[PDB]
Ligand binder design. Structure first.
Ligand SMILES: [Zn+2]
Lengths: 697, 486, 135, 493, 117
DNA sequence: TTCCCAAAAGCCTAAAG
DNA sequence: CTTTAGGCTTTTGGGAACTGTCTACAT
RNA sequence: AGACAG
């Protein structure tokens, strides 16, 4: 009934073409899958999918990197913060600027190219840029380069042609209690393999308003913020700027007071602790005769500002030389023009022209502006969302040790545990196919590792593979087995491997990798369930469908009574990983007493958000007024709305032998009802109109 | 017994103020000093987009100290009160000019605007002030034209003093023929019962907090409705800020103009800053932005536990139980409160044994409960189980766990699934509030609200547990009964 | 019950799929509402509801106890039936293939995609109106 | 992976479109000609000025534009402006040009302006924020909507709708469609709507209109009102266009006729203008056709050269699209992927308003001072950029946690209604015949890729789409075969 | 439309006894709703002596007509009217100033700061 | 933007001095 | 015969999900 | 008011 025929191409569906078995999942699951592709950060440990389609090649080809746009000759190479040993030495160089000339043109346009250590586009996620060794070593003035040459490419792009989006996990479909509702059960090692890299920027302004404190230096050396390549304190705190007051000099300017941070009355920017600092950008208004910062606390600031000033001065000098050489023939790239203008905005103006009043989006700038950009590696242990490259999305609800995870008789250790029945409801069956097929393929490879005198779960050394390749008979037999398995799974791949020049290389690659990577195209003439039946009803190629033993929550080492199959699913991490939790015992208040939202500077100043959550909306207050008498609900809203009631609540917390189980929070006799600010405002506004709502007599 | 509206006699409010009474009539304006004083009384100013530091201050921004409480500032003759707890009282007052009998109640103006004021003709304006221009032949309607003709034939004087003094006869004529045409009985009874309260001598100009001006780069942001109010007050100023004193007719006209501006302001403000979906009544009067509240992704415990058991994590526990930890630190260790806050904030992103012990001892000292009582909310709030009480039992020692171990059983009461959803948590600060919330505890949604004698389907066991029970119970581990006997 | 767990893999799907009556119920079907959603689905329900055919299978053991609603398993093993567009109209030509086998054509994939789009819209805007009426 | 396996996978895989993968906005905005080094934006500006040059007072020649030196770029960004040399410190990826005009061979003050300077991957940085610039899927010459022919001009956004009307012929009642179009924006006895034949009769005489646009004569077969005047037409010289004119005439006459006393005044013009006297509006409507609209209509298959020819074509040839349309609103073939016309909407509006308010003042001698004042008040620094982040819906905020621009960055399309985004609307997208299933999605757009923006397939862009020069969506032949069949099934009854 | 040429609006019915079964069948066609809930909703819809502008719940429950949603919301208790749309309409209403017996609503205690009396 | 639904306008028809 | 009341049809205007995050903003 | 999360 044309069950094995697919009248489709990879062309008619782009992102859905990232996976095979797309037609075995419901459309909602597929749309969610594409959305999760869009929302996935980049993992440090990236691996190619076990099942390959032709889309991944194109997606790897079109990615973000540092490309020479045209055939150009490199004219100059510049580097911020010169690296070496000295007084004002810098540990690491963040950014390298390449000034190049697009020759083979009448104009010979001069352009700029930036090579940083990272590239970030999402608000809090990014990825390190790995530099091409064969190209980065050759980067020098007066060199030749081709068009579309790649530097500082993402780590997700492999050395061969493939893009790494997720991690292959030996998933097991057990209906364990850990996977209740929609969740995953994970181990420490697999989560170590999935650590997102987060790049963040902290901005602090210190001028006449406030001055930096001392948080990274001893009494002798004053350090407001970590250097380049330094590590944030165990309590992630930077800047901690304190308001400048002369009359409080012997109180808040002593060496102990500068090191000591008062959580209230001071302004700190609190990032992830232990996060290595990538780089620092310094902006200084140098044309103020009285320097607001008192002498002594401007060492690192002046250091980094001097390095940046030298960098931008060298850029400006290069532009001036080019202009003096080719006036009216200096057609330049727009990026180079903007870079020169930024350098001019950075460098001080001559004394014959009024100084620059620098702003940042209507926000005035005073003296010192510091932008510290730092990277961290998030360790997933809970509230981290994951997807299986299908519609299945879940949250890590249990993290166990490597030993505690399910292990087969072959020794395969499970990386994830998923509730199988969800597939029966969400109707995303392609996963299972992948799962199932992956297991077979994996076992096939392991079978060869047992028949070649090798060990499973251990990458063989080159000597062992050379010894195995010594005899042609077993190599050809293994290649024939691989051909048979491909014929069962992918007839297209079967033909491709039939037209193979060196089968010994293929067998060696399969043994080294430990898994035969399978090309399963979108237009693959396969009857999926027929292939499943063939794998099941075969002496070879059959996955080890045996008992599996794990450790339950009670600590016992228990073996599952029914046969369980372990198979590789290609997992992926998502955004909304958490870190947005907002616990706030007490929230800062507007002049009209009510909690408010958090502005950027005041929201990046607390470890974790300190937002006042609107947990009492109209629907919530409806449910409270109905389930409970309106009295207690009005009391809660009065404690929140009236600042005096909230102050009384906090006083009751602080002035009790047992802060928990306070008999009465607010003594209503001392603080009567009716003091809530919104209600008082409403009543006063009505009274200004001549009316007032009152109870019927 | 209900809740009805009652007309307020502005004279009684004026007499009960007994403080610093300053009137808006005596602002001649047109000069720097009086304009600045008027801007100080009106126009609550925010000079820059920056957080203020004066917790307690006077009307002027000169007494920034807070220990000076109740001290009358010599500059403003106004006592110093908390900025957040500042009493909401009318900022100014307006009295009748020297040639005006009295002032019309703004509620009466708004009530009469619905009927008297029409697109083709303004009946109240024609009846009250003299400088009103109209063309009878320009009335494009028929009912309005007939009403205008009847009013013209009746022939009332068009003075404010005449309207106030003979308000009974004018109002009866308005009732009689067609002018209002509806709600005649209620409106007539309202006028007859509250006649004395509809013409107050003094009229309050609302509080400084009502009117907000935020100066910043690119100007000074204001609101739209405030504008109307401003005009009204300015109008009364122009009554006394005249080089040539106005004739009584002109004074009546300006007074009516100001009163109409007040009525329009109150109508627009009630329609916009209260009635709209974001506002005062529907946004703050019925709950907004609680304190002692957290919000986090719900990751749970699949372990033998209690249904009324919750596990708040390290960061949420430290920030939410900030003052509990401060109290414990101060009580046990000789630590100042500043050192207590420093320790707590320093150890939010890091683990230590001391704060964990303090959490354990807090939860233990919550004696007749499993832990610290709290409420847990899932949005949108549809059912009884969307909001449910839980008891905090343990902060998690793992700093990387920003998770909330709500019970597995209580999952189905809301639509809570572990797919990456953040739920809200409110800490109950009292035993009375915990006892009150006991009515929102999960055991309240066991019995189905739509079936007489049936437990609600929200108590059904989850997927994995049911499948485990199936694979255990429904197995052929024994021969059939006949073979077992034989 | 730390060892009496439930497990899902390709073997269970093959065990349900390879049943001869299911295979018959997925072949020789007139593409009509009566010939699909009353005859073939009836045969598949008769296969599932038999208390003797499938024993020890996680999928059907869960199905017999309400863990899985019958509709999803029917749309998987049997033919998917007449998806809907954004407006609630039924396409004349049904879907020949379920979810266990692959829906590899273009027409069927597009119409099931439109069913998913209908799901999203009927979630969003109908919630918008329904919550106001509830309030 | 086996390198040979990857090689065979590459061989057995169709490549995407480098035009669309690297950024179609990049190609349509920041691509330089090889003969002369000039961006696409600069050429678009020159085209707009050359189109608007018809409205110059014989000597105000537009010389062109140059690329400003970064020295001048910084000097012009940071001006004195009341003793505060204000500078905005931000990346703000931009580049400055200067528009230069000439007057009788002497230069004026050049007017500098800023331009977005798109990067690879449709990426811009504006005021320190990273934005993604998506193309807008636009109809080439005109759209056909639920019951309407929607035609956009440089100024107006006109819509041609239709209704039914009755007229008596030979004593028997007959029904004909009257095509109307509201053009007086201030417009928003039975209430009727401005018919196109009403505009014909308002401009030309009724007999003049009939003689000029048809081989039909008029008296004052027999045509008469339903529920006085009599229009007699030769028994053999009849046409659908003449019948439509008759129907529109009776539609405009049957409800009004208190101003019709002597029927001969119907042959005049002032009477019809009174029935509709904004002669400025009439003249703007007459001279409300420009070169781009004419070129697009020629591309579609219409031969408009004057707006009255356009009205004749709509009344006679394009009216077929109003009742039974061969093309469908549901499809997406034969559509453009416009970028510049929406990015430079502010600049286009500024140039149009400058030209109109400059011609409308006087036709006398122009002084250099007045020309400089007009240029200063018209072409400011941020004329085309002040509204990029607020008024344009094609510029979105980038929140991609990936190294790949394909998945979220470069594969976003925006519909026109979502492209403006100043409306802040919600059509509910369900009771819309526009959002029906069509096979075009499979070739243009991505079904099963269903964001909440457009839950159907039109939200995103199919990355293998064949797009030729000037951003016209071409149709790949081979898959087209299969696609055709699918479409039939989508309309199975 | 039911709750709030011939249609089946609730206000068109004379007594709630003959009005309950229609709503019961209409709901039970697609949602399985208990009769008690339907009775409570209809009884909430009711009004006693609508001519005399009395909007409180009838007793024992039959001696009383029906009323539309907006009039009941804006003419029963101003505290409950504040949480619904168009607060200026009952604020600017003569009837709201008349000392008439009225029903109690929980929002009353929220309309004021919490003062019981 | 478009559908819901109530409240005021407006209109023909009818009854009392 | 003249002058208003009564009820039906038009027109107009307020209103249209909850919580959280982020984004935009001088010339 | 646009996107995202539920
Ligand atoms: Zn003072």
């Amino acid at each position: 009934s044309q069950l094995g025929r697919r009248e489709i191409d990879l062309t008619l569906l782009g992102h859905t073409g990232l996976d095979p078995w797309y037609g075995t999942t419901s459309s909602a699951r597929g749309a969610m899958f594409v959305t999760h592709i869009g929302q996935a950060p980049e993992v440090n440990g990236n691996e190619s999918r076990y099942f390959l389609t032709g889309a991944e090649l194109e997606y790897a080809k079109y990615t973000h990197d540092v490309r020479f746009p045209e055939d150009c000759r490199v004219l100059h190479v510049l580097r911020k913060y010169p690296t070496g040993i000295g007084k004002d030495s810098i540990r690491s160089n963040p950014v390298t600027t390449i000034i190049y000339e697009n020759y083979f043109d009448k104009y010979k346009t001069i352009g700029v190219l930036h090579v940083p250590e990272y590239m970030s586009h999402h608000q809090d996620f990014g990825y390190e840029l790995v530099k091409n060794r064969e190209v980065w070593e050759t980067i020098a003035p007066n060199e030749m380069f081709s068009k579309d040459t790649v530097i500082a490419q993402s780590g997700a792009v492999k050395k061969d042609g493939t893009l790494g989006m997720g991690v292959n996990a030996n998933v097991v479909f057990l209906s364990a209690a850990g996977t209740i509702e929609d969740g995953f059960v994970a181990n420490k090692n697999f989560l170590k393999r999935m650590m997102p890299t987060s790049y963040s920027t902290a901005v602090a302004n210190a001028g006449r308003k406030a001055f930096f404190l001392n948080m990274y230096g001893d009494d002798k050396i004053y350090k407001p913020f970590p250097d380049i390549g330094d590590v944030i304190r165990p309590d992630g705190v930077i800047f901690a700027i304190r308001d400048h007051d002369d009359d409080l000099a012997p109180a808040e300017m002593t060496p102990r007071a500068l090191r000591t941070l008062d959580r209230t009355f001071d302004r700190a920017v609190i990032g992830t602790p232990g996060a290595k600092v990538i780089d620092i950008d310094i902006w200084r208004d140098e044309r103020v005769n009285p320097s607001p910062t008192p002498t002594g606390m401007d060492a690192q600031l002046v250091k980094y500002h001097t390095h940046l000033s030298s960098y931008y001065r060298e850029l400006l000098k290069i532009y001036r030389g080019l202009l003096a050489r080719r006036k009216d023939d200096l057609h330049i790239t727009e990026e180079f023009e903007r870079l020169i203008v930024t350098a001019q905005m950075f460098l001080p103006q001559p004394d014959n022209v009024r100084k620059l009043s620098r702003f940042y989006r209507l926000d005035p700038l005073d003296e010192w502006r510091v932008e510290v950009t730092y990277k961290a590696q998030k360790m997933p242990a809970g509230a981290f969302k994951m997807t299986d490259f299908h519609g299945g999305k879940g949250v890590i609800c249990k993290v166990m040790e490597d030993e505690d995870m399910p292990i087969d008789e072959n020794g395969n250790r499970a990386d994830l545990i998923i509730f199988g029945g969800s597939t029966m409801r969400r109707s995303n069956y392609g996963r299972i196919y992948e799962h199932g097929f992956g297991a077979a393929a994996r076992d096939l490879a392991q079978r060869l590792r047992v028949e070649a005198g090798l060990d499973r779960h251990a990458k063989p050394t080159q000597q062992q593979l050379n010894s195995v390749m010594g005899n042609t008979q077993w190599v050809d037999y293994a290649f024939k087995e691989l051909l048979g398995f491909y014929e069962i799974i992918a007839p297209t791949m079967h033909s491709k491997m039939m037209e193979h020049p060196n089968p010994a290389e293929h067998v060696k690659t399969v043994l080294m990798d430990g898994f035969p990577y399978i090309y399963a195209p979108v237009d693959d003439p396969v009857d999926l369930m027929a292939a499943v039946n063939k794998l099941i009803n075969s002496d070879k190629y059959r996955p080890h469908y045996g008992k599996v033993s794990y450790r339950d929550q009670a600590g016992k080492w228990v073996t599952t009574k029914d046969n369980v199959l372990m198979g590789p699913l290609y997992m992926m991490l998502l955004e909304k990983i958490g870190e947005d939790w907002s616990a706030a015992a007490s929230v800062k208040t507007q002049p009209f007493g009510l909690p408010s939202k958090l502005n950027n500077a005041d929201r990046a100043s607390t470890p974790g958000r300190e937002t006042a959550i609107r947990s009492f909306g109209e629907s919530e207050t409806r449910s409270y007024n109905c389930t409970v008498g309106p009295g207690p609900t009005a009391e809660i809203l009065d404690q929140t709305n009236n600042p005096l009631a909230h102050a009384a609540v906090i006083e009751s917390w602080l002035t009790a032998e047992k802060p928990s189980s306070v008999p009465v929070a607010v003594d209503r006799e001392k603080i009567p009802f009716g003091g809530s600010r919104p209600v008082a405002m409403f009543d006063h506004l009505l009274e200004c109109s001549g009316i007032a709502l009152e109870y019927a007599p | 017994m209900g809740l009805y509206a009652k007309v307020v006699d502005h004279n009684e409010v004026h007499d009960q103020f007994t403080g610093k009474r300053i009137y808006a009539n005596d602002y001649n304006t047109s000069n720097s000093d009086e304009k600045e004083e008027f801007d100080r009384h009106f126009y609550s100013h925010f000079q820059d987009s920056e957080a203020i530091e004066s917790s307690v201050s006077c009307d002027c921004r000169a007494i920034e100290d807070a220990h000076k409480l109740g001290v009358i500032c010599d500059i403003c003759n106004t006592p110093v009160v908390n900025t957040s707890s500042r009493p909401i009282e009318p900022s100014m007052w307006v009295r009748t000019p020297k040639h005006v009998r009295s002032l019309i109640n703004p509620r009466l103006i708004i009530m009469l605007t619905g009927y008297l004021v029409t697109k083709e003709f303004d009946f109240l304006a024609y009846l009250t002030d003299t400088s009103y221009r109209y063309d009878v032949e320009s009335i494009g309607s028929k009912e309005t034209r007939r009403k205008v003709d009847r009013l013209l034939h009746r022939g009332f004087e068009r003075g404010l003093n005449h309207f106030i003094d003979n308000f009974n006869e004018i109002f009866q004529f308005l009732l009689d023929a067609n002018i209002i045409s509806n709600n005649k009985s209620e409106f007539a009874q309202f006028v007859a019962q509250n006649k004395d309260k509809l013409f107050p001598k003094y009229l309050p100009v609302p509080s400084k907090l009502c009117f907000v001006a935020e100066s910043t780069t690119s100007g000074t942001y204001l609101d739209k409705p405030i504008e109307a109010a401003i005009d009204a007050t300015l109008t009364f100023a122009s009554i006394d800020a005249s080089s040539v004193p106005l004739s009584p007719i002109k004074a009546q006209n300006r007074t009516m103009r100001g009163l109409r501006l007040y009525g329009q302001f109150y109508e627009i403000y009630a329609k916009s800053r209260i009635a709209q979906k974001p506002g005062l009544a529907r946004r703050h009067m019925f709950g907004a932005r609680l304190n002692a509240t957290a919000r986090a992704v719900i990751t749970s415990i699949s372990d033998p536990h209690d249904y009324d058991e919750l596990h708040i994590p390290w960061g949420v526990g430290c920030q939410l139980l900030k003052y509990h930890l401060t109290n414990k630190l101060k009580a046990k260790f000789n630590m100042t409160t500043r050192e207590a806050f420093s320790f707590v904030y320093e150890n939010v992103l890091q683990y230590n044994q001391i704060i964990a012990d303090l959490f354990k001892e807090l939860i233990a000292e919550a004696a007749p409960y499993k832990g610290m009582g709290c409420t847990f909310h899932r949005n949108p709030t549809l059912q009884r189980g969307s909001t449910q009480q839980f008891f905090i039992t343990k902060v998690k020692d793992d700093i990387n766990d920003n998770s909330i171990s709500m019970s597995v059983l209580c999952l189905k009461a809301p639509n809570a699934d572990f797919d990456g959803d953040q739920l809200n948590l409110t800490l109950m600060p009292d035993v009375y509030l915990t006892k009150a919330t006991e009515r929102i505890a999960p055991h309240t949604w066991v019995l189905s609200i739509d079936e007489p004698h049936e437990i609600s389907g929200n108590l059904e066991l989850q997927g994995p547990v049911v499948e485990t029970i199936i694979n255990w119970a429904h197995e052929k581990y024994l021969p059939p009964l006949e073979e077992w006997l034989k | 019950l730390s060892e009496y767990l439930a497990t899902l893999s390709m073997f269970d799907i093959a065990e349900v799929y390879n049943h001869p009556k299911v295979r018959e119920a997925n072949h020789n079907i007139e593409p009509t509402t009566y010939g699909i959603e009353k005859i073939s689905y009836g045969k598949v329900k008769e296969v599932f509801n038999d208390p003797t055919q499938f024993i020890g299978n996680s999928i059907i053991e869960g199905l017999r106890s309400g863990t899985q609603k019958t509709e999803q398993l029917l749309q998987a093993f049997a033919w998917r039936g007449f998806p809907t567009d954004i407006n609630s109209d039924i396409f004349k030509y049904p879907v020949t293939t379920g979810y266990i086998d692959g829906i590899w054509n273009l027409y069927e994939n597009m119409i099931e995609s439109r069913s998913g789009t209908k799901a999203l819209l009927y979630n969003k805007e109908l919630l918008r109106v329904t919550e106001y009426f509830n309030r | 992976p086996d390198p040979f396996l990857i090689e065979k996978i590459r061989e057995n895989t169709p490549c995407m479109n480098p035009t669309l993968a690297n950024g179609i906005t990049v190609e349509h905005t920041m691509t330089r000609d090889p003969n002369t080094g000039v961006n696409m934006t600069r050429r678009y500006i020159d085209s707009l000025f050359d189109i608007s040059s018809v409205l110059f007072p014989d000597g105000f020649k537009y010389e062109g534009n140059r690329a400003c030196t970064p020295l001048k770029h910084f000097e012009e960004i940071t001006r004195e402006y009341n003793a505060k040399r204000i500078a905005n410190i931000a990346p703000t990826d931009m580049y400055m040009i200067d528009l230069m005009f000439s007057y009788k061979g002497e230069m004026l003050y050049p007017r500098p302006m800023l331009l977005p300077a798109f990067k690879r991957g449709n990426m811009v940085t504006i005021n320190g924020a990273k934005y993604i610039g998506s193309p807008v899927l636009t109809d080439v010459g005109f759209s056909v909507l639920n019951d309407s022919i929607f035609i956009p001009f440089r100024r107006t956004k006109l819509t041609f709708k239709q209704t039914d009307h009755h007229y008596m012929c030979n004593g028997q009642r007959k029904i004909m469609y009257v095509i109307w179009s509201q053009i007086h924006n201030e417009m928003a006895r039975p209430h009727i709507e401005s018919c196109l034949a009403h505009y014909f009769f308002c401009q030309f005489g009724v007999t003049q209109t009939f003689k000029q646009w048809a081989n039909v004569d008029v008296k004052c077969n027999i045509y008469s009102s339903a529920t006085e005047m009599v229009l007699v037409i030769p028994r053999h010289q009849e046409s659908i266009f003449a019948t439509r004119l008759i129907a529109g005439f009776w539609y405009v006459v049957d409800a009004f006729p208190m101003r019709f006393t002597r029927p001969e005044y119907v042959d005049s013009t002032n009477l019809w203008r009174v029935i509709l006297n904004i002669d400025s509006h009439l003249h703007s409507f007459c001279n409300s056709l420009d070169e781009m609209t004419i070129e697009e209509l020629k591309t579609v298959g219409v031969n408009v050269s004057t707006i009255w020819e356009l009205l004749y074509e709509i009344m006679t040839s394009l009216a077929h699209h109003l009742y039974a349309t061969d093309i469908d609103e549901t499809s997406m073939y034969g559509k453009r992927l416009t970028v510049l016309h929406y990015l430079m909407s502010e600049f286009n509006y500024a140039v149009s308003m400058f030209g109109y308010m400059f011609q409308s003042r006087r036709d006398r001698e122009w002084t250099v001072q007045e020309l400089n004042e007009g240029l200063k008040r018209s072409f400011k620094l941020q004329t085309a950029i002040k509204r990029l982040t607020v008024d344009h819906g094609e510029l979105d905020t980038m929140s991609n946690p990936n190294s790949s621009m394909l998945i979220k960055g470069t594969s976003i399309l925006v519909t026109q209604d979502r492209a403006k985004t100043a409306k802040a609307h919600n059509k509910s997208l369900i009771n819309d015949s526009s959002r029906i299933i069509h096979a075009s999605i499979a070739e243009v757009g991505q079904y099963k890729n269903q964001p909440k923006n457009n839950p159907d397939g039109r939200g995103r862009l199919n990355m293998y789409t064949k797009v030729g020069p000037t951003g016209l969506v071409e149709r790949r032949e081979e898959v087209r075969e299969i696609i055709d069949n699918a479409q039939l099934m989508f309309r199975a009854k | 439309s039911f709750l709030h040429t011939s249609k089946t609006y609730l206000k068109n019915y004379k007594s709630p006894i003959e009005a309950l079964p229609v709503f019961a069948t209409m709901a039970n066609e697609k949602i399985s709703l208990n009769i008690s809930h339907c009775e409570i909703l209809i009884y909430a819809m009711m009004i006693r002596s609508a001519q005399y502008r009395d909007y409180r719940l009838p007793k024992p429950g039959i001696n009383g007509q029906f009323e539309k949603y907006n009039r009941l919301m804006q003419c029963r208790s101003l505290g409950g009217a504040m949480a619904f749309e168009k607060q200026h309409e009952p604020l600017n209403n003569p009837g709201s100033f008349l000392n008439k017996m009225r029903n109690d609503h929980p929002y009353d205690l929220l309309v004021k700061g919490g003062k019981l009396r």
